Write an enzyme that holds these catalytic residues in place. Structure first.
Site, PDB file in Angstrom:
ATOM      1  N   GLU D 759      -1.825  -9.371  10.915  1.00  0.00           N
ATOM      2  CA  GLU D 759      -2.368  -9.908  12.163  1.00  0.00           C
ATOM      3  C   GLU D 759      -3.759 -10.507  11.940  1.00  0.00           C
ATOM      4  OE1 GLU D 759      -1.030 -10.074  15.327  1.00  0.00           O
ATOM      5  OE2 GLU D 759       0.272  -8.344  15.682  1.00  0.00           O
ATOM      6  N   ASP D 760      -3.763 -11.575  11.141  1.00  0.00           N
ATOM      7  CA  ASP D 760      -4.850 -12.497  10.826  1.00  0.00           C
ATOM      8  C   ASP D 760      -5.872 -11.933   9.846  1.00  0.00           C
ATOM      9  OD1 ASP D 760      -4.854 -15.235  12.358  1.00  0.00           O
ATOM     10  OD2 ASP D 760      -4.249 -13.755  13.866  1.00  0.00           O
ATOM     11  N   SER D 761      -5.794 -10.669   9.450  1.00  0.00           N
ATOM     12  CA  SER D 761      -6.816 -10.152   8.557  1.00  0.00           C
ATOM     13  C   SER D 761      -6.624 -10.643   7.129  1.00  0.00           C
ATOM     14  CB  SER D 761      -6.838  -8.635   8.568  1.00  0.00           C
ATOM     15  OG  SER D 761      -7.354  -8.190   9.790  1.00  0.00           O
TER      16      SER D 761
END
Ligand SMILES: [Zn+2]
Ligand SMILES: [Zn+2]
Ligand SMILES: [Zn+2]
Ligand SMILES: [Zn+2]
Lengths: 116, 66, 140, 1131
Positions: D759-761
């Site tokens: 989730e975008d990390s």
DNA sequence: AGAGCGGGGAGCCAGCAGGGAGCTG
RNA sequence: GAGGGAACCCACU
DNA sequence: CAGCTCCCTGCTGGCTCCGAGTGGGTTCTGCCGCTCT
């Protein structure tokens, strides 16, 4: 079709329709001065509802020189027989109902416009 | 600003290779051949010399306050 | 990674073109590529010369000199196209008066350019802020 | 010689490089300010009416040639000195130049001649000078001369220095003036309206708008009325024509209807004639208008004068403001009615508000001209008040006492400092955000802020039409760069080669039109209009012409050779409606296009050869403009051109689309702005990702300017090792991005590793970070001055001793020196003191007003600068330096909108490795790609792998057929890698091969300003607000978080009533009041003596203790202040 | 005498001006 | 061991 | 039966609403001249 305005000659103004029952005819009588004028046409008010079939008077021939307008060679002129023509559509609100191509002859001094 | 001492990815010393790289470039080596002459075989070090912007030459144009 | 890219002007050469029609329409698509026609008369060269521009007529008439006396009528075709508000006087062929009018118009353009350039910057004075350099102590 | 297609890319980038060698990127700001200083200030001074004061002798005051100095500083000693920009930045001085005017005062006495006194060069104020403009001290200096002045040669200029703060003037999109616009009003009494924001050219006066409207159907027919300025009711248009001096009807209808065979125009003017029949005389019409003005008149003569001056100076000022101009004004009003009739008949089409042919751009020039117009009117008002106050009683006035020099100075300073544009006394109605603090976070931020446009539309509007990406923004406005949130589609950026027109005099065009067979309106019969082409010059109908081919070709030929028609003059021909419009006014945005004639470029190989040696031919872009090769085309003129996207469009096709191309694009990638031209392969990305990267390339961290050591910026971020990208576009050379870069080329594996990149990390390499990967410094500057507040309050920089100073925050003062300031090299912490200031109060004579460091901010004092401000007080600025190592939660972004936070950091032995021992610097999740559709990210990784192996710098210009994924794949396979970028990675923990092969390659990541240590916040208890006794606002004030209304609703739906009480009563503002058990009003309660007493009831035994929020007590006391009794009945 | 005091949209509701019916002398 | 408000602008999710 | 009264409808004006939560910044209060010694 449509009947134009009538203008007074003395005070340079508009005329107005009126019915003189003495001759029982129709006269265009100005109401700024005493000028009167008999009427050639009896039509006073006239309206067009579905009589919008003639889009060609709104088209001016100058649009043959528009570089953005599309040119075709498959629709030759009837007047001068030139191969090149420009085709477009009528762009009024009263022409949203139609996508009819209107053609204007590309050659100078011809100016012939047609449809289909 | 100034050439990093080590390659970020692996840790190969690249701080001693910037002036050699510039001297090879002004000797009209191509950048790939200049990198190959310096022994930088992994592309992680080739980006380290290839993509470097040496800003310190332009920070030395300013007269020192201290 | 090729990009598909093309356009099309929609619509709706299906034409029986014989020898003279094919020849005239080829010339009507490559007018400007003529150096010297040789000894062709005007009557067979009638249509393509009508669909032509006066710079190209000038080039043809300076390459095909002997044709000028049979081109003059076509120059009226240009004249009423461009200088419609004019009539030639007596002993005036349309070609030479057309070129005289063109040269006079471009010289008038040059004179207008020269006049408006000097009569707007070099002649008058436009008011502008100039450097003071006073170092005035009006503001202390 | 025509440029063959194999040389065309080099040719177009050579001519683009010539454009950016001459014009630059902030040319529009500098040009507008230069034309404001040279021409607009003098026009404002001269066009101001002379001051004619008579009590009596008569004084005539006339203003004359203005004089502007260079920016100078006057100290308290009064000695002038040349003010350099860094001195203004450091000492908080306003970088302004004094404006000197010449004044002539003539005295008239009874039976006596004039007396002329020449006050040469009278100081009237200080104009803030824009940086690197003509009247700046940095103008004409070389790079060495700028570095000797501690300036940056890469710094663009284009901004002002107001109180040491760099201010940029954002351009404002106004509607275009002098142009008739017909719109159908939505749900109004008018079916169609036609407006003209009329304003006379080269004269700064507010625009006077006239409406010509046509009423809705649901009388006999359709009535055309006229909403005039300063006439508060709707005058019928025939009455306006009568008041203009036209009794007849062929006069009015020849002014309106140009062809008399047309019947429909007559059938629609018939109700307007027949409704205004009872008024037939000019002065009767003038009475009928003036009776409904803003100021009515009891006298008929006064009403005639009122209507005459309204129709003389207010109704259509641009066509004429002088007498005998009734015919030109009447033709223009008839043209407005004609356009209304054409649009109501449907024959013509309604105008578009969002079309930038209908919009001008107020840059620094016109905005400062509007300000200086108002402020010079204020100055003349003050001079006339002072001189009238003297000559009422006194003999004579000295003029230098009458000149209030604070008017111009403090007005310009206020509007450039606050951004509230206008006057300070009307700040609530003044437009804000016109002036903004210049963004100096990276160089892309600076350039993007200096090239910024703004639609003056409320950001709360739910209509989407001004926010839409309109079709006419092509090449003028960047399609990607816009803010997210409430200002999307309103704040915009220029494209790279877009130039905003600076303004020109209409005159030489007018003499040329006079001597080129144009018949004036004042010398023609209207019967000639119906087949002739009308000619408009700056919206002024000046005549007609009967040969528009030769006129338009002649005008274009003149403009293409830098003759009478200057290059920025816009010349539109509307063929279908027989109009030629010439616009010379400022604010039109245009761009250069190549000229295509007869399906061939006029740009040939000799121009490219001459531009190849720009240093040694003195050949430049301006010679291309003079050669008739390139042409500046604006938005209205772009409606009449036929563009070719590439010269390949000019080639004959098997399906020929167009053979009448008029211009050709230089390169299509000049539709992008500054921040969207950093994106590699923007056309392979989804457009929201392009917009996101345009936003986040301004928050990236790099080297924001070269002289960052001289500057004391409030917040500054400097990257340790910025690298230029391996995958650049060719537009990045003219943004100077490879000299002030803002990121590092990472080795990025797009892999699912340990789950910490979900989730975008991202997962960063701890070993890389230890070697300086994305390490940076945060500089924070604190300012403090010894302000002298009267005789008593004397704040002084003294090292505080507890024996004499009160009001401390109980922190150690040992790191301070004996001059009251800390010194460079000292480690500091969030509680420490950096400036010791003590104020003298009327034992504890002194109170401690020491400047403390920001909370939880470790750092080292980088610089201390001590100076004198403009007021002569001691002034200090301390720059503290904090090294920011990349950390879990720091926001890193690529150039494709793939923002994220660092989720974990693994060491080199833990991160996966290729067979060469190459571990990634960053690992991103695969799932960040598919719904995002950022294929430009994958292609950038591939091209960066190719460029790092080859040694080249990869080209990623958006529209480039020479670069495609298959070519890069074959190139990568030529170096012994897999062609699609995948590699066999091994698990760092176990050594085992990962079954999938991981897409790994060099990708340009940038570190954003949004670091986690600048956002982490917590509270137990602390400062409460003064009024409502609730916790404070923000982490800077140790405030609390807002438990807002939706949190209350969620806790209601949870059923957690006691948690709701804890949040909304105990953890915010618990309070106890004492309430009378009879009346319910809060009662007096001495809790020391247990004396509970309620006045109004004389109650002393029935008082109850009631626990409430303090905000409830405050609400109830505001209600009892509001004459409302909340009677809190406990039963 | 300087120090110090003074002077945009959207949508709903409410009141008033027009009807059309009924009413009485 | 705790001494300003307001206006505005930019940015973040 | 004409004029008056008395309730339905049409119009215009007035009024009130416009997501939640965060950082950071600058600029303003305050605005200047007085009457007394
Ligand atoms: Zn008459
Ligand atoms: Zn024809
Ligand atoms: Zn390496
Ligand atoms: Zn009580």
């Amino acid at each position: 079709g449509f009947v134009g305005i009538r203008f007074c000659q003395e005070c340079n103004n508009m005329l107005y329709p009126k019915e003189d029952k003495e001759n029982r005819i129709l006269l265009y009588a100005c109401r700024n001065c005493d000028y009167q004028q008999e009427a050639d046409n009896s039509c006073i008010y006239v309206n067009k509802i579905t009589h919008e079939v003639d889009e060609l008077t709104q088209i001016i021939a100058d649009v043959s020189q528009d570089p953005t307008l599309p040119r075709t060679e498959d629709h030759p002129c009837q007047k001068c027989g030139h191969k090149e023509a420009v085709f477009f559509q009528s762009h009024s609100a009263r022409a949203e109902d139609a996508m009819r191509l209107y053609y204007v002859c590309t050659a100078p001094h011809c100016g012939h416009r047609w449809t289909e | 600003m100034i050439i990093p001492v080590r390659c970020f990815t692996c840790g190969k010393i690249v701080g001693n290779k910037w002036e050699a790289y510039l001297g090879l470039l002004q000797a009209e080596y191509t950048e790939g051949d200049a990198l190959d002459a310096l022994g930088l075989k992994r592309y992680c070090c080739r980006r380290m010399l290839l993509a470097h912007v040496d800003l310190i030459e332009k920070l030395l144009n300013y007269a020192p306050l201290e | 990674g090729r990009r598909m890219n093309s356009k099309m002007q929609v619509y709706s050469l299906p034409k029986m073109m014989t020898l003279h029609q094919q020849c005239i329409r080829v010339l009507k698509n490559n007018i400007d590529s003529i150096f010297e026609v040789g000894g062709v008369p005007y009557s067979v060269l009638e249509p393509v010369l009508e669909r032509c521009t006066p710079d190209q007529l000038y080039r043809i008439e300076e390459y095909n000199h002997v044709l000028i006396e049979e081109t003059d009528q076509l120059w009226k075709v240009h004249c009423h196209r461009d200088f419609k508000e004019e009539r030639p006087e007596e002993y005036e062929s349309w070609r030479e008066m057309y070129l005289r009018l063109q040269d006079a118009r471009e010289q008038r353009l040059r004179v207008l350019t020269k006049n408006i350039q000097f009569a707007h910057a070099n002649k008058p004075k436009g008011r502008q802020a100039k450097m003071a350099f006073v170092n005035s102590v009006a503001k202390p | 010689d025509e440029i063959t297609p194999d040389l065309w890319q080099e040719a177009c980038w050579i001519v683009i490089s010539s454009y950016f060698d001459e014009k630059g990127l902030v040319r529009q700001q500098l040009d507008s300010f230069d034309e404001f200083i040279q021409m607009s200030v003098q026009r404002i001074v001269e066009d101001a009416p002379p001051i004619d004061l008579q009590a009596p002798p008569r004084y005539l005051l006339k203003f004359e040639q203005i004089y502007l100095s260079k920016p100078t500083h006057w100290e308290r000693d009064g000695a002038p000195s040349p003010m350099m920009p860094n001195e203004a930045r450091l000492r908080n001085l306003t970088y302004s130049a004094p404006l000197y005017v010449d004044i002539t005062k003539t005295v008239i006495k009874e039976g006596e001649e004039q007396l002329q006194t020449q006050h040469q060069k009278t100081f009237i104020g200080k104009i803030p000078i824009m940086l690197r403009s003509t009247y700046c001290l940095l103008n004409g200096l070389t790079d060495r001369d700028l570095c000797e002045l501690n300036e940056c040669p890469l710094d663009p200029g284009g901004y002002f220095i107001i109180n040491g703060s760099e201010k940029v003037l954002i351009a404002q999109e106004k509607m275009a003036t002098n142009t008739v616009y017909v719109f159908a009003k939505k749900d109004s009494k008018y079916a169609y309206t036609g407006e003209c924001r009329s304003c006379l050219e080269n004269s700064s006066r507010p625009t006077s708008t006239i409406w010509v409207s046509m009423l809705a159907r649901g009388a006999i027919g359709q009535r055309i009325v006229a909403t005039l300025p300063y006439i508060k009711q709707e005058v019928p248009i025939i009455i306006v024509f009568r008041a203009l001096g036209f009794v007849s009807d062929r006069d009015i209808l020849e002014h309106i209807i140009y062809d008399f065979e047309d019947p429909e125009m007559m059938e629609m003017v018939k109700p307007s004639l027949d409704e205004a029949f009872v008024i037939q005389e000019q002065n009767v019409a003038l009475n009928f208008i003036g009776s409904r003005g803003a100021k009515p008149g009891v006298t008929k003569e006064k009403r005639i004068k009122y209507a005459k001056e309204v129709l003389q100076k207010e109704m259509l000022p641009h066509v004429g403001v002088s007498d005998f101009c009734e015919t030109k004004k009447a033709y223009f009003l008839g043209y407005m009615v004609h356009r209304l009739l054409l649009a109501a008949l449907g024959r013509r089409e309604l105008d578009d508000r969002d079309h930038y042919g209908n919009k001008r751009l107020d840059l620094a020039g016109p905005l400062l001209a509007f300000l200086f117009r108002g402020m010079f009117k204020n100055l003349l008002k003050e001079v006339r008040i002072y001189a009238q106050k003297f000559i009422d009683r006194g003999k004579d006035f000295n003029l230098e006492l009458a000149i209030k020099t604070r008017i111009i100075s403090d007005g310009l300073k206020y509007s450039l400092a606050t951004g509230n544009w206008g006057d300070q006394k009307k700040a609530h109605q003044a437009r804000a955000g016109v002036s903004q603090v210049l963004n100096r976070l990276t160089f892309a931020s600076t350039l993007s802020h200096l090239r910024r446009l703004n639609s003056p539309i409320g950001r709360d509007g739910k209509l989407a039409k001004p926010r839409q990406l309109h079709n006419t923004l092509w090449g003028m406005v960047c399609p990607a760069e816009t803010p997210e949130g409430h200002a999307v589609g309103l704040v915009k950026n220029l494209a790279l080669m877009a130039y905003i027109s600076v303004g020109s005099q209409p005159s030489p065009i007018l003499e040329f039109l006079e001597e080129w067979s144009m018949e004036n309106l004042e010398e023609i019969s209207p019967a000639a209009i119906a087949d002739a082409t009308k000619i408009f010059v700056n919206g002024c109908w000046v005549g007609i012409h009967k040969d528009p081919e030769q006129l338009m070709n002649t005008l274009r030929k003149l403009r293409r050779q830098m003759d009478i028609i200057v290059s920025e003059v816009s010349m539109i021909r509307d063929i279908r409606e027989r109009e030629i419009r010439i616009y010379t006014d400022a604010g039109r945005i245009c761009r250069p296009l190549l000229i295509v004639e007869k399906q061939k470029l006029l740009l040939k190989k000799r121009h490219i050869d001459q531009l190849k040696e720009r240093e040694y031919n003195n050949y430049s872009w301006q010679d291309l403009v003079a050669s008739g090769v390139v042409e500046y085309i604006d938005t209205l003129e772009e409606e009449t051109v036929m563009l070719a996207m590439t010269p390949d469009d000019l080639q004959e096709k098997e399906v020929a689309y167009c053979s009448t191309y008029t211009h050709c694009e230089i390169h299509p990638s000049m539709i992008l702005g500054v921040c969207a031209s950093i994106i590699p392969f923007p056309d392979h990305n989804q457009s929201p990702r392009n917009t996101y990267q345009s936003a986040m390339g301004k928050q990236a961290m790099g080297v924001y300017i070269t002289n960052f050591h001289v500057r004391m910026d409030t917040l500054a971020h400097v990257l340790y090792y910025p690298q230029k990208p391996l995958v650049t576009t060719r537009s990045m050379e003219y943004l100077r991005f490879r000299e002030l870069p803002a990121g590092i080329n990472s080795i990025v594996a797009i892999a699912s590793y340990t789950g910490y990149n979900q989730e975008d990390s991202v997962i960063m390499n701890r070993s890389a970070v230890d070697r300086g990967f994305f390490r940076s410094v945060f500089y924070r500057s604190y300012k403090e001055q010894e302000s002298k507040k009267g005789f008593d309050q004397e704040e002084v920089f003294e090292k505080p001793t507890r024996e004499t100073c009160q009001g401390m925050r109980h922190a150690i003062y040992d790191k301070l020196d004996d001059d009251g300031l800390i010194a460079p090299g000292v480690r500091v912490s969030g509680d420490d003191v950096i400036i010791g200031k003590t104020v003298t109060l009327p034992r504890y004579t002194k109170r401690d007003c020491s400047t403390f460091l920001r909370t939880s901010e470790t750092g080292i004092v980088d610089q201390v600068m001590v100076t004198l401000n403009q007021e002569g007080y001691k002034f200090c600025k301390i720059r503290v330096r904090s090294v920011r190592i990349p950390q879990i939660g720091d926001k890193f972004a690529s150039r494709h909108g793939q923002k994220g936070t660092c989720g974990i950091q693994y060491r080199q032995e833990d991160m996966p490795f290729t067979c060469e021992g190459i571990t990634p610097d960053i690992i991103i999740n695969p799932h960040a790609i598919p719904s995002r559709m950022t294929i430009g990210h994958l292609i950038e990784c591939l091209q960066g792998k190719v460029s790092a192996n080859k040694g080249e710098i990869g080209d990623a210009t958006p529209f480039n057929d020479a670069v495609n994924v298959q070519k890069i794949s074959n190139l990568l396979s030529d170096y012994g890698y897999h062609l699609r970028g995948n590699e066999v990675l091994y698990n760092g923990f176990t050594g085992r091969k990962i079954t999938s092969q991981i897409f790994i390659g060099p990708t340009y990541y940038q570190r954003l300003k949004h670091m986690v240590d600048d956002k982490i916040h917590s509270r137990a208890r602390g400062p409460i607000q003064i009024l409502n006794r609730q916790p404070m606002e923000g982490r800077s004030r140790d405030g609390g978080l807002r438990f807002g209304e939706m949190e209350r609703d969620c806790q209601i739906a949870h059923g957690a009533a006691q948690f709701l009480r804890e949040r909304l009563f105990e953890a915010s503002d618990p309070y106890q009041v004492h309430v009378c058990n009879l009346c319910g009003i809060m009662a007096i309660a001495n809790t020391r003596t247990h004396t509970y007493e309620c006045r109004g009831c004389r109650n002393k035994t029935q008082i109850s203790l009631v626990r409430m929020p303090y905000a409830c007590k405050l609400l109830f006391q505001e209600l009892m202040s509001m004459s409302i009794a909340p009677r809190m009945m406990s039963v």
